[PDB]
Design a protein around this nucleic acid. Structure first.
Ligand SMILES: Nc1ncnc2c1ncn2[C@H]1C[C@H](O)[C@@H](COP(=O)(O)OP(=O)(O)OP(=O)(O)O)O1
Ligand SMILES: [Ca+2]
Ligand SMILES: [Mg+2]
Length: 430
DNA sequence: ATTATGACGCT
DNA sequence: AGCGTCAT
């Protein structure tokens, strides 16, 4: 009753650029705009691996993790843009710089947590308070929410998509004007007005469109964002949670898409997030651990307390290459040459990072995969990162991994290496 | 041969 | 510290 927390204290958004690498390439090459197109890395093996897909191409069934040759079977007119190759490997610099464009615009509106290259959480609580102070009791016009969906509406007593969107929005605003909603609902609504403004500024100033979710915490905002894509935003209110979760597969909630979610389904014999409400907190903790159990108990009721962390920059800078199948590295010369290529890219990115962001990395992490090992990483070793020098970093990485070579012949490397990874970590201000 | 990243938890 | 999990 009067003491039960409802997790309605914050306004949180999740902004997700639509098919981001595709939009970067379409901005650069207008011939790709408004077409089925995809971004591919490499080309020799089966036409290259697809890593991003325009919504027009998705309509044909093109997905990521698809070979370009196969996507062409589904969409013969599919256009492709290739990721730049430098030093013999894919180089993602263009997309990192475009990401910085968008992150810097978002930072003008509120504190952001960079969640991925194309994804940021936004803590809008304070901005909403300010905007409400400016509004001074003035109602919110539907014109301020031209791309907003209210999840769960319309309901109760038009066959077009936009018509439904407007009907639900009208019902929501009508009940806010009449005072049949809560103060959290108004806070979320103002949050959505701000997110409309943020998304308009991103598109105006970069050309890039995005979707967004607005709710009371990060998990609901993330879930909301995916409900109406592309180029739309979705408000998930606290009151919408019971119906939304009643048919929501557990795997759709962030962090439950893998082994833990599968175990939740198997151990409890449930399918949907809402079914979790029937277990006590102690029950969930007994199956899934103290932390996971408390998190699940609150989350299935729409409550989550994870803060939007004030972090616009990545915490690590890494360079990685797989050497699949027959291309696995089998000589020492090979391993050293590729460590050097990775280390040269890393040095370049680190020097740029130091100049832009007033920080220096102090730890170098070296990871490898050996042929046959099912795990993504077979071995990880750290050493001190004391100079931004590619030859030193590559020599140090070799030193930390050289004892993995079983081969009795110094010149040969066995088992062959199927992945090399160098990562700079533990930044300090400079 | 579903690549190149990136964050974070466990012990 | 090194490994595992989850996601983009
Ligand atoms: N598995 C991956 N491997 C490599 N790059 C990826 C991978 N997943 C995503 N990316 C890249 C390309 C995407 O443009 C960008 C953002 O990822 P993601 O949000 O999942 O999809 P998306 O932005 O391409 O489409 P959507 O609009 O549905 O979000 O990061
Ligand atoms: Ca995206
Ligand atoms: Mg994303």
């Amino acid at each position: 009753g009067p003491h039960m927390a409802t997790g309605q204290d914050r306004v949180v958004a999740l902004v997700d650029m639509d098919c981001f690498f595709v939009q970067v390439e379409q901005r650069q090459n207008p011939h790709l705009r408004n077409k089925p197109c995809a971004v591919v890395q490499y080309k020799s093996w089966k036409g290259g691996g697809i890593i991003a897909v325009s919504y027009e191409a998705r309509a044909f069934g093109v997905t990521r993790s698809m070979w370009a040759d196969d996507a062409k079977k589904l969409c013969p007119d599919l256009l492709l843009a290739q990721v730049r190759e430098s030093r013999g490997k894919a180089n993602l610099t263009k997309y990192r710089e475009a990401s910085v464009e968008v992150m810097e615009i978002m930072s003008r509106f509120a504190v952001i947590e960079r969640a991925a290259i194309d994804e940021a959480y936004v803590d809008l609580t304070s901005a909403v308070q300010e905007r409400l102070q400016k509004l001074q009791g003035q109602p919110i016009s539907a014109d301020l929410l031209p791309s907003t969906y209210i999840e769960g509406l319309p309901q109760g007593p038009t066959v077009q998509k936009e018509g439904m969107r407007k009907q639900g929005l009208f019902q929501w605003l009508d009940s806010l004007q009449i005072d049949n909603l809560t103060s959290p609902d108004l806070q979320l609504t103002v949050g959505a007005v701000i997110v409309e403004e943020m998304r308009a500024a991103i598109e105006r100033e970069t050309g890039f469109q995005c979707s967004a979710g607005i709710s009371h915490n990060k998990v609901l905002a993330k879930l909301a964002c995916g409900l109406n894509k592309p180029n739309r935003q979705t408000l998930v209110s606290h009151g919408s949670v019971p119906q939304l979760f009643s048919q929501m597969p557990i795997r759709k909630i962030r962090s439950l898409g893998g082994k833990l979610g599968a175990s939740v389904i198997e151990i409890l014999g449930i399918e949907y997030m809402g079914e979790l409400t029937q277990f006590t907190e102690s029950q969930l903790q007994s199956h899934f651990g103290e932390k996971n159990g408390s998190w699940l108990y609150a989350m299935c009721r729409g409550i989550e307390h994870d803060p939007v962390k004030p972090r616009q920059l990545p915490k690590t800078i890494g360079c990685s290459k797989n050497f699949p199948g027959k291309t696995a590295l089998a000589t020492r010369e090979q391993v050293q040459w590729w460590l050097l290529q990775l280390a040269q890219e890393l040095e370049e990115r680190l020097t740029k990072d130091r100049n832009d962001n007033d920080r220096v990395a102090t730890q170098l992490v070296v990871s490898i995969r050996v042929q046959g090992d099912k795990r993504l990483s077979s071995l990880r070793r750290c050493c001190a990162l004391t100079r931004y020098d590619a030859h030193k970093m590559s020599h140090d990485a070799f030193t930390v991994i050289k004892n993995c070579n079983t081969s009795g012949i110094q010149t040969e490397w066995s088992p062959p290496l199927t992945m090399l990874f160098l990562c700079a970590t533990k930044f300090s201000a400079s």
